[PDB]
RNA sequence: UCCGCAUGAUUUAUAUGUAUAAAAAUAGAGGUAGGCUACUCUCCUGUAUCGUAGAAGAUGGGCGAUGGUUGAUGAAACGGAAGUGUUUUAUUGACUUGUCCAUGAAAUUCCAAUCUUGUGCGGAAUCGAAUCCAUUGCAUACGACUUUA
RNA sequence: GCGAAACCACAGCCUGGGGAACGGGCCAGGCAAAAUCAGCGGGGCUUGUGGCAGUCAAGCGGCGACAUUGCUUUCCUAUCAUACCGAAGCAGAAUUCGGUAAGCGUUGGACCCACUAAUAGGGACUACUGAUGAAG
RNA sequence: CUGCCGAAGUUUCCCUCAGGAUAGCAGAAACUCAGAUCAGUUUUAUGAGUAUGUAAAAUGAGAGUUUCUAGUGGGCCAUUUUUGGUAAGCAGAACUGGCGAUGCGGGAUGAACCGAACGUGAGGUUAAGGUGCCGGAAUGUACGCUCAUCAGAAGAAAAGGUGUUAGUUCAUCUAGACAGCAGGACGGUGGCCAUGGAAGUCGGAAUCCGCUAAGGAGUGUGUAACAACUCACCUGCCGAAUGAACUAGCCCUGAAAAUGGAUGGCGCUUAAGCGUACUACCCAUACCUCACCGUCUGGGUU
RNA sequence: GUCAGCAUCAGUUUUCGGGGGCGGAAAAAGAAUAAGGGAAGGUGGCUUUCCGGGAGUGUUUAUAGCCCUUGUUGUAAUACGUCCACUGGGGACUGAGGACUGCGGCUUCGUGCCAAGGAUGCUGACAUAAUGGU
C-alpha cells in the first residue's frame, strides 16, 4: 500500500528510557560534581569494557554518559554551572570524560595494551605467510581447525581438504597505514594488541581551589 | 461562484420565549436562498430548532476585507463518509476566503469524491504566524526565494506550418 | 514538492559536456559517452558543481534523480580511477582452461566439468580480460565503465553454471572475488 | 475487447442487476 | 532556463481583457496563481493565473508584496519600459499592432513602397 | 482555417488517434490530405501494452476460410489508414469518397518531399502527453509484428535528409544575401511607420 | 499520326494567386566573426514571407537601372522511393510603373486564360497480334493448361 | 432430341448486441466486383479445503475474523509426455513437488495386459473444395 | 373515405354454469339552482389518542340528476408497506402508479429507463441527453485523482499490494532525530537439571546480580563442543527531520474456460477516463408567435 | 407573367453596443496623504564567515520595504445586483385581413398628419427563361 523500508522487530524488552535516561545521566553528573574529590575528567577510550571494569574496580565512579550532555546539564555559562570558570572547562569538556572517586600515578603509568581500533596506524608491518593459516603469526608449537573462519574471511583464502589456505601472501597491515574496518576485523582474529589506553588529568575542579588547569 | 454570508436567525417570539436569542453563523452559499436553507439545516441539526418555528432576522453578504493580501487559511470540516462520520483539516493559500472554500470543495470532490451535501464546514481561520503553518506543501511555498519554471506551459487554425517552440 | 535537488562535485575529470541529455565525460583515463534521454530531469553545470534538479516531480519521477547522480559518479570514477574485477576460478577435478584473444576482449573456456563444449564469450565494449600470475587461476577484468565490466563479470559467471547437479556438492564454477579499482 | 470477457453487460445483466440490488436493499430493511 | 517565476519578473499578459499589456509579478500566491501589477493606469492590481501570462526575459529587483506606488517607482527608476521595447520581440509585437490598424489606402501605400523596395535586386556579380 | 487543394502533413510526433480524428474531419470537409512519414507516429501507453493491443488484432480472423477474415495490415501507413477509416462512415458513398481523398505513405516520396509539410497542434505529442509518460512509435511497433521495410525506409530517409539539408543551406545562403540587400534599401524605414 | 486552321464548341470537387521542401529537441535549438571552441545575438507559431497598382489588364512619351518580367526557344547539368521535376543556361520576340505624364472606357445608366474530345482540314509518313478450325499429352469430367502449325 | 413436379411473403456473407426467440432484415462492426462448371451436402451460475461445542479477541455494537481444544475437424489449459525452470538429504542414476508452456504427440488387444516418451482432462439459397471467366 | 366522442379490466352483488350483472367509463333524451352546488386539494377550528373525523377558510369549476344502452370484467412492470422464511434466492397479501388504445426526443440497439402526450406548415427556444470522429454541438475554461504485460468510461467482496495521493491518532528530534558508519556490545558464569558432545542460540523453570552510557542466564546464523559474526543496548563522527498504527480517493489481485468481438465502433492516457465548478453551444411532434384545416362553444344577423 | 434588389413599416425574434439612475460594510479594495502599532518569508545595514560575490548572523527602515489601526483626500472610483414608459446598430422568418368606423398620439382647430383595429413604396431583369409541376 506504500513503498517504505520494512522495520525489523525483536523481543529484547530492553528499550532505553530515552528522555528519562538522559535525565538520569544529568542527575548522575550533578552527583558526580557533588562528589568528594579527585575531580577527574576521563571516562573511556578505544579499549573494551574490560579496561573500564578494571578501572572502575580501582575506585570507591567513572561515568560520562552522552558526551556534552553532562556539560549541557551543568551549563557552559558560569551562571548555570555550579563550578567556577566552567565556560572554558566546557570547551575542554568533550568526548569520553567523567568524574571519579577512589589516581594520577596509576593513570600516568598503568596503560594496558588492547586490540587496535579502526583509523589508527599499525604498530608494525604484519604479514600473513601463505599456506595454512597462522592465528598468532606462527606462535603455536594457531591450529588449522578454523573451518568456519574460511567462509567468514572473504580474503584470498580457499579450503583445501578442510584446511584454510591463503593462495597468495596477504599483508594484514603495514605501519603508517590507516587501520581500515576490514583490516581491524582481520587483525581481531589475531593477537595484535596495537593500542594503549590513556587518560586525561589536565585539571581538577576542586571544591575550594576551583582550578581546573589545561595541562 | 460561492459567496460568504452571515445569517442571523431565531425562533418566533411567544409566551414561552418572549425574546429568543439571536443565532448567527457564517456559511458559504452560491446565492441567498441556499444560505437560508443551509442555515435552517444547521440550526435544526445542532440546536434542535424547527424551521417552521423560526425566521431569519438578518442576512448579509461579506466581501473579503483585503482581497489583494496573500493569506493562508486553515479549514476544519466534518466530512460525511461511507460511515457518515469523519473529520478533516486542510490548509490553503489564496487571497479570498471564498476562494479557499471553493478550492476546498473541488479538493473534496477530487480526493474523496464528495458532494456539496456531505461537507459541513466547521471553521475557516486566517493563520498569520509562519511556524503555525502545518502542511508541507504550503510551508515550502512560504520560503523567501520562491522561483520555479512555468509548470505545465502547454503552449482554431488547424495545420500550423512550423513545429511549436513549446519552450522558451 | 516543487524542487528536489541533488549536488555533485566534479573532480579533475576534464570534459563533462551534457548536450541533449548526452554526457561525454572524458578524464585522464579515457572517454565515455552516455545517454540520459530516458529520464526527464534538469542538469545544470555551475563551475565545479553539477546540479540535478526536478521541478514538480512525483516520487516515481523523483527516484530517478539519485540514480542519475550515481551513474554519473560511476563514469567519473571510471575516467579517473577505473574499475577492476577479480574472478577466481574453482575447479575440483577438471581444470578450467581459459584462452584470451583480441587483447583480452574475448574469452574461451574449455574442460569445464569435463564438458567439451567451447564456452566462448565476447566481453562488453571497454572490458579487457587478463590472467593474473600473483594468484593462480583467477582473472582480472579491467575497464572504464562499471556497467560493462560488471555485466561482463556476470556473463562469464552465468556461462559456467553447474547443471542438474547439486549446488551443495558440485560447487564448481567461476565466481567474482573482489570488486575494486585500478588505483 | 482486449480482455478475457465483455465489458458491455448484456441487457439481462442490465435487467437483473438493479432488481437484485433492490432485493439487497429490502434485505437490509428487514 | 531563461524564464523563472520570480517575485519581480515582468510578464506579458496573453489572455483576458488586458491582453498585450505588461505587468510585473509582485507576489506568488500558489503554484497556479500569482499577483501582478503595472504602473500603467488602466491596468489594476489583481491575481492572475499562469495560463494567462507569458514570462519575459526582464527581472527587476522589487521587495515582496510592494504596494502600487513603490512598484511604479521601481519600474520607472529601473527603466522597465524602453527596456522591454528595446528587444526585437517587443518591436515585432508593435509592428503587428500598427499593421493591424492600416486601412485600405494605407495598404496601397504599403503596396507601392515595398514594390519600390523589391525592384532594387542589386547583387554583386 | 484556409483550404488548399492538397495538404501534406509530416506525421512525426503526432498521436495516432489525435491526428486521425482531425484528418477524418478534414476529409469529410472535402479536402485532399497526404500524410507523410507515418512510421514515426506515436501512440500513448508503453510499447508492450500496445504490442498486445495489436497482437489481439491478429487474433480476429473468420474460422471458415480465413481468406474471408479480417486483413491485419502491418505497414504504419496502413495502421494509420485503419484509424481514419474507422472514424469515417465508410459503409456509404460519402464515407467511401473520404478515404479516396486520403493518402498515407511511410517516409516522404519524391512527389511530395519538395512541398511544405504542416503539422497539427491538436495532435502533437509534446503538447498533449505529460512528460515522463510512456509511449511507443508506430514504426517500431510495425517492425515487430510483420512489417519488413523499416530499415530501407530509414535508409532512404537518411539520404533524403542529406539532400534536403543541402537545399536548405543553398536557400539560406541566398536568403541571407537578399536580407542584406533588403535592409540595405533606404525605403525600408520610410515605410517602417506602417509596421513592415 | 501531326501540321494545321479549325469548326462547333466540348470543359473542369480547376478556380480565381492551383503561391512557400531544412533537421531535431521541447528540463531546448539556431545564427556571428577570430583562433576544439570562450564570447555576442536570435525563438515566445503564418495576422508571416513572396507576388499583388492597368480598355481582365489598351495605345504613346519622357526620366532613371542592366534590371524585373513573360511567350516561344537551341542547348548543358542533376533528380529512381511513386524519378510527376529541379537547375544551368545562353537566345529570340515581347512585356516593359522603378518614377512622372497624355489619350480611351460610359445608355452593360441601382445586384443578377487551360481542358480536351470534337469533327473534319490538305499536307507529311506509318504496314501488328489473338482465338476458333487442326495438332501435341508433360495436362484433362467439360473449360483450362503444355506444345506444333 | 424430348422434357416434368414439389416448393415459392421477400430475400440469401460473417462476429457481437438487441429483456424473449435472439433473427435473415434492427444496431455496431468485419467487409463487399459480373457470369458461371463440377464435387461435399455442412447449414456474472460454476471449482481447494465438513458439521457440533467451548476458548480467545482485531474490533464493532452481544457478536466477533483467522487460530485453539474437544469425536466421527477445430478450440480450452485446469500439462500425461517432450522443452526450460526453482526447490527437496538432490552424491550419481532414478524420482518427488512447483512454475512458464497447448508448438507438438496422447497406442494396440479381451477394470484389465502389454507396448510406448506418454497413453492428460474437457467444450463445440449461402457456405466449403477445386475449375473457367468478361473488364477497365 | 374523412371527421367527432371514446372506456374496461377491477368494481356491485348474484349465482348450477359460463357468465351476467352492477358500477365505472363512454354516452343519449328531460328537468331543477346562478348556487357553498361541487372537488383523487390545501388550510383553520373542533373532540378522541404529523395523522383521525366533523364543521368552516383557501382554491378551481356552473354545478345536479332520475330515466336506457353499447364495450370491458384480464394481466405485466416497478414503488411502498410484509409475515413465514435460508447458503442462497422465495413465498404472502394490501396499496400505488405506468402499460394495454401511444406515436416523438434520448439512453449504440430494446414491452416498461430518462424527457415528452401527436391536426398541416414557418420561425424561435428548450427538456432529457450530449459537444474528439463516426454525429448536429467547446480537441472549451478552472481545480484535482488515476499508469493498469490486456486501465476505465448488486456476485464472488472478505481480505492482500515495498503502487500513489491526502488526511486522523500517537512517537523521538542541534541534551544531535531516522539512517548510515567506526567502537563497545562486559565481567560472576560453561548459573541449574539435562549429555557422547550443549559454553545464551538440541533441550525444562527461573533467568539473578558489580561497572554503568550498555551489554537480554541471550536476537539469529554457526560450531561435535568451542570460538566468531549480527542484533537489543549504548558511545564516537554525522547534521534535521523522521518513525508507528489507522481512515479515505484511484489503481493492481480477490478463478473462468473451450470457432474471432466489442465502453456501439475507431480510438483516447496532463483524456476523448474519474470528480467538481463555470460558461458557450446542439435539438423533440415539447414550449412560444403567426398562417391554414376541422370540430366544439360563444356573440351578432329582416 | 416569372424572379430578384432596396427602402420605410407591422408581428415574432436573435445578437452586440452606449448612457443614466438606484442598492450593499451607502460594495469591499485601492491611490494619495497624516498619526500610532507590529514585525517579518530580515532589506539597508549588521557583525562573523567563507569564493566584488556567496553564505549566514542576530536585529526593526536606515542606502528596500511589509503588515495592523485611525484620520484624511472622500461624500473617491470600481465590481456586482437591480431599474430606465433612455438609446445606437447587425440578422432571420412572417405580410394573414381587404372601402368606412374604433382605441390613441400628433395635430389644428375645419382640417388633417401619423409607426394608431394585419405591407406598402421605388427599381431592374427575364418571355423559345425563370419559377411551378410530373
Swiss-Prot record, chain B:
Subcellular compartments: Cytoplasm
Coiled-coil residue spans: none
Main location: cytoplasm
GO process terms (BP): cytoplasmic translation
Tagged with keyword Secreted: no
GO molecular function terms noted in the UniProt entry: structural constituent of ribosome
InterPro entries: Ribosomal_eL20, Ribosomal_eL20_dom, Ribosomal_eL20_eukaryotes
Keyword field: Cytoplasm, Ribonucleoprotein, Ribosomal protein
Known role: Component of the ribosome, a large ribonucleoprotein complex responsible for the synthesis of proteins in the cell. The small ribosomal subunit (SSU) binds messenger RNAs (mRNAs) and translates the encoded message by selecting cognate aminoacyl-transfer RNA (tRNA) molecules. The large subunit (LSU) contains the ribosomal catalytic site termed the peptidyl transferase center (PTC), which catalyzes the formation of peptide bonds, thereby polymerizing the amino acids delivered by tRNAs into a polypeptide chain.
Protein name stated in the entry: Large ribosomal subunit protein eL20A
Species, as recorded: Schizosaccharomyces pombe (strain 972 / ATCC 24843)
UniProtKB/Swiss-Prot annotation, chain C:
Coiled-coil blocks: none
Entry's Gene Ontology cellular component terms: cytosol; cytosolic large ribosomal subunit; nucleus; preribosome
A GO term, aspect molecular function: structural constituent of ribosome
Keywords for this protein: Cytoplasm, Nucleus, Ribonucleoprotein, Ribosomal protein
Entry superkingdom: Eukaryota
A single GO BP: cytoplasmic translation
Pfam families xrefs: Ribosomal_L6
Family annotation (SUPFAM superfamilies): Ribosomal protein L6
Record Gene3D superfamilies: Ribosomal protein L6, alpha-beta domain (3.90.930.12)
Family per similarity comment: Belongs to the universal ribosomal protein uL6 family.
Function: Component of the ribosome, a large ribonucleoprotein complex responsible for the synthesis of proteins in the cell. The small ribosomal subunit (SSU) binds messenger RNAs (mRNAs) and translates the encoded message by selecting cognate aminoacyl-transfer RNA (tRNA) molecules. The large subunit (LSU) contains the ribosomal catalytic site termed the peptidyl transferase center (PTC), which catalyzes the formation of peptide bonds, thereby polymerizing the amino acids delivered by tRNAs into a polypeptide chain.
Protein name in the entry: Large ribosomal subunit protein uL6A
Taxonomy of the source species: Eukaryota, Fungi, Dikarya, Ascomycota, Taphrinomycotina
UniProtKB/Swiss-Prot annotation, chain D:
Comp. bias (Basic and acidic residues): 15-25
Gene knockout outcome: 20-40% of cells exhibit morphogenetic aberrations represented by irregular, uneven, or overdeposition of septum material as well as septation and cell separation defects, often resulting in pseudofilamentous or multiseptated cells, suggesting a failure of cytokinesis in those cells. Cultures of null mutant cells did not appear to exhibit a growth arrest.
Subcellular location: Nucleus, Nucleolus
Start-end of Basic residues biased regions: 1-14
Family: Belongs to the TRAFAC class YlqF/YawG GTPase family.
Entry function: Required for optimal growth. Required for normal processing of ribosomal pre-rRNA. Required for nuclear export of ribosomal protein rpl2501.
Domain comment in the entry: In contrast to other GTP-binding proteins, this family is characterized by a circular permutation of the GTPase motifs described by a G4-G1-G3 pattern.
Designated name of the protein: GTPase grn1
Organism: Schizosaccharomyces pombe (strain 972 / ATCC 24843)
Organism phylogeny: Eukaryota, Fungi, Dikarya, Ascomycota, Taphrinomycotina
Gene name of the record: grn1
Span within the parent record: 3 to 32 of 470
Swiss-Prot record, chain E:
UniProt KW Phosphoprotein keyword: no
Alphabetical UniProt keywords: Cytoplasm, Nucleus, Ribonucleoprotein, Ribosomal protein
Location(s), subcellular: Cytoplasm; Nucleus
Keyword Ribosomal protein among record annotations: yes
Main subcellular location of this protein, as a coarse class: cytoplasm
Highest taxon of the lineage: Eukaryota
Xref: Pfam families: KOW, Ribosomal_L14e
GO biological process: cytoplasmic translation; ribosomal large subunit biogenesis
GO molecular function: RNA binding; structural constituent of ribosome
GO annotations of cellular component type: cytosol; cytosolic large ribosomal subunit; nucleus; preribosome
Cited function: Component of the ribosome, a large ribonucleoprotein complex responsible for the synthesis of proteins in the cell. The small ribosomal subunit (SSU) binds messenger RNAs (mRNAs) and translates the encoded message by selecting cognate aminoacyl-transfer RNA (tRNA) molecules. The large subunit (LSU) contains the ribosomal catalytic site termed the peptidyl transferase center (PTC), which catalyzes the formation of peptide bonds, thereby polymerizing the amino acids delivered by tRNAs into a polypeptide chain.
Record family assignment: Belongs to the eukaryotic ribosomal protein eL14 family.
Subunit structure: Component of the large ribosomal subunit (LSU). Mature yeast ribosomes consist of a small (40S) and a large (60S) subunit. The 40S small subunit contains 1 molecule of ribosomal RNA (18S rRNA) and at least 33 different proteins. The large 60S subunit contains 3 rRNA molecules (25S, 5.8S and 5S rRNA) and at least 46 different proteins.
Name of the protein in question: Large ribosomal subunit protein eL14
Amino acid at each position: 500500500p506504500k513503498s517504505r523500508r520494512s522495520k525489523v522487530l525483536t523481543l529484547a524488552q530492553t528499550e532505553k528510557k530515552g528522555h528519562e535516561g538522559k535525565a538520569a545521566l544529568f542527575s548522575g553528573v550533578q552527583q558526580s560534581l557533588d562528589s568528594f574529590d579527585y575531580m577527574w575528567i576521563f571516562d573511556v577510550t578505544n579499549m573494551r569494557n574490560t579496561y573500564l571494569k578494571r578501572i572502575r574496580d580501582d575506585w570507591k565512579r567513572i561515568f560520562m554518559g552522552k558526551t556534552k550532555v553532562m556539560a549541557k546539564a551543568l551549563g557552559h555559562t558560569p551562571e548555570e554551572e555550579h563550578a567556577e570558570n566552567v565556560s572554558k572547562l566546557t570547551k575542554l569538556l568533550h568526548g569520553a570524560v567523567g568524574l571519579l572517586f577512589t589516581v594520577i600515578g596509576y593513570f600516568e603509568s598503568f596503560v594496558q595494551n588492547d586490540f587496535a581500533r579502526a583509523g589508527a596506524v599499525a604498530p608494525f608491518t604484519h604479514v600473513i605467510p601463505a599456506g595454512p593459516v597462522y592465528s598468532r603469526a606462527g606462535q603455536i608449537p594457531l591450529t588449522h581447525t578454523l573451518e568456519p573462519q574460511v567462509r567468514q574471511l572473504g580474503m584470498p583464502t580457499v579450503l583445501k581438504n578442510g584446511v584454510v589456505t591463503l593462495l597468495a601472501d596477504f599483508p594484514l597491515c603495514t605501519e603508517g597505514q590507516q587501520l581500515d574496518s576490514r583490516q581491524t576485523r582481520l587483525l581481531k582474529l589475531f593477537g595484535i594488541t596495537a593500542a594503549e589506553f590513556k587518560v586525561g588529568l589536565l585539571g581538577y575542579y576542586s571544591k575550594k581551589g576551583a582550578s581546573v588547569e589545561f595541562l | 461562484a460561492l459567496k460568504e454570508y452571515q445569517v442571523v436567525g431565531r425562533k418566533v417570539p411567544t409566551e414561552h420565549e418572549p425574546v429568543p436569542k439571536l443565532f448567527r453563523m457564517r456559511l458559504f452559499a452560491p446565492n441567498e436562498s441556499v444560505a437560508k436553507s443551509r442555515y435552517w439545516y444547521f440550526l435544526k441539526m445542532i440546536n434542535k430548532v424547527k424551521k417552521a418555528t423560526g425566521e431569519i432576522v438578518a442576512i448579509n453578504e461579506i466581501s473579503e476585507p483585503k482581497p489583494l493580501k496573500a493569506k493562508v487559511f486553515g479549514i476544519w470540516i466534518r466530512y460525511d463518509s461511507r460511515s457518515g462520520t469523519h473529520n478533516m483539516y486542510k490548509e490553503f493559500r489564496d487571497t479570498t476566503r471564498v476562494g479557499a472554500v471553493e478550492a476546498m470543495y473541488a479538493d473534496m470532490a477530487a480526493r474523496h469524491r464528495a458532494r456539496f451535501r456531505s461537507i459541513r464546514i466547521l471553521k475557516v481561520v486566517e493563520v498569520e504566524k509562519k511556524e503555525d503553518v502545518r502542511r508541507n506543501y504550503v510551508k515550502q511555498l512560504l520560503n523567501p526565494h520562491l522561483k520555479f519554471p512555468l509548470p505545465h506551459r502547454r503552449t482554431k487554425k488547424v495545420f500550423a506550418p512550423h513545429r511549436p517552440s513549446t519552450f522558451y | 514538492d516543487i524542487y528536489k535537488d541533488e549536488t555533485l562535485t566534479i573532480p579533475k575529470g576534464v570534459t563533462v559536456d551534457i548536450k541533449a541529455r548526452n554526457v561525454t565525460v572524458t578524464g585522464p583515463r579515457g572517454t565515455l559517452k552516455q545517454n540520459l534521454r530516458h529520464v526527464d530531469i534538469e542538469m545544470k553545470k555551475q563551475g565545479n558543481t553539477i546540479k540535478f534538479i526536478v521541478w514538480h516531480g512525483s516520487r516515481k519521477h523523483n527516484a530517478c534523480i539519485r540514480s542519475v547522480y550515481s551513474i554519473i559518479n560511476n563514469m567519473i570514477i571510471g575516467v579517473t580511477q577505473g574499475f577492476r574485477y577479480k574472478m577466481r576460478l574453482v575447479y575440483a577435478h577438471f581444470p578450467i582452461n581459459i584462452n584470451l584473444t583480441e587483447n583480452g576482449t574475448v574469452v574461451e573456456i574449455r574442460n569445464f566439468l569435463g564438458e567439451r563444449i567451447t564456452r566462448v564469450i565476447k566481453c562488453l565494449p571497454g572490458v579487457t580480460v587478463s590472467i593474473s600470475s600473483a594468484v593462480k587461476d583467477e582473472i582480472i577484468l579491467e575497464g572504464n565503465s562499471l556497467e560493462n565490466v560488471s555485466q561482463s563479470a556476470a556473463n562469464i559467471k552465468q556461462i559456467c553454471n553447474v547443471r542438474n547437479k547439486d549446488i551443495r556438492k558440485f560447487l564448481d564454477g567461476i565466481y567474482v572475488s573482489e570488486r575494486g579499482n585500478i588505483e | 475487447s482486449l480482455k478475457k470477457k465483455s465489458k458491455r453487460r448484456t441487457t439481462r445483466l442490465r435487467s437483473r442487476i438493479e432488481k437484485k440490488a433492490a432485493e439487497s436493499k429490502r434485505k437490509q430493511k428487514r | 532556463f531563461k524564464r523563472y517565476v520570480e517575485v519581480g519578473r515582468v510578464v506579458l499578459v496573453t489572455k483576458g481583457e488586458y491582453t498585450g499589456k505588461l505587468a510585473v509579478i509582485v507576489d506568488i500566491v500558489d503554484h497556479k496563481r500569482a499577483l501582478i501589477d503595472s504602473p500603467c493606469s488602466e491596468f489594476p492590481r489583481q491575481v492572475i493565473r499562469y495560463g494567462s501570462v507569458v514570462l519575459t526575459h526582464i527581472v527587476m529587483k522589487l521587495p515582496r508584496g510592494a504596494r502600487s506606488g513603490i512598484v511604479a517607482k521601481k519600474w520607472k527608476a529601473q527603466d522597465v519600459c524602453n527596456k522591454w521595447a528595446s528587444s526585437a520581440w517587443a518591436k515585432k509585437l508593435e509592428a503587428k499592432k500598427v499593421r493591424s490598424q492600416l486601412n485600405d489606402f494605407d495598404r496601397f501605400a504599403v503596396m507601392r513602397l515595398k514594390k519600390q523596395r523589391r525592384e532594387q535586386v542589386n547583387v554583386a556579380v | 482555417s484556409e483550404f488548399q487543394k492538397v495538404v501534406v502533413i509530416d506525421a512525426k510526433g503526432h498521436l495516432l488517434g489525435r491526428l486521425a480524428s482531425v484528418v477524418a474531419k478534414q476529409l469529410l470537409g472535402g479536402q485532399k490530405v497526404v500524410v507523410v512519414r507515418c512510421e514515426e507516429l506515436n501512440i500513448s501507453g508503453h510499447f508492450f501494452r500496445n504490442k498486445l493491443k495489436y497482437l489481439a488484432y491478429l487474433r480476429k480472423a473468420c474460422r471458415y476460410n480465413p481468406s474471408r477474415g479480417a486483413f491485419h495490415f502491418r505497414a504504419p501507413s496502413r495502421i494509420f489508414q485503419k484509424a481514419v477509416r474507422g472514424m469515417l462512415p465508410h459503409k456509404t458513398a460519402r464515407g467511401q469518397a473520404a478515404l479516396e481523398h486520403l493518402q498515407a505513405v511511410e517516409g516522404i516520396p519524391p512527389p511530395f518531399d519538395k512541398q511544405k509539410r504542416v503539422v497539427v497542434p491538436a495532435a502533437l505529442r509534446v503538447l498533449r502527453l505529460k512528460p515522463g509518460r510512456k509511449y511507443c512509435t508506430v514504426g517500431r511497433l510495425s517492425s515487430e509484428v510483420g512489417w519488413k521495410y523499416n530499415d530501407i525506409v530509414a535508409k532512404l530517409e537518411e539520404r533524403r535528409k542529406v539532400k534536403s539539408a543541402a537545399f536548405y543551406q543553398a536557400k539560406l545562403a541566398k536568403q541571407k544575401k537578399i536580407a542584406s540587400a533588403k535592409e540595405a534599401s533606404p525605403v525600408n524605414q520610410k515605410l517602417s511607420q506602417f509596421g513592415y
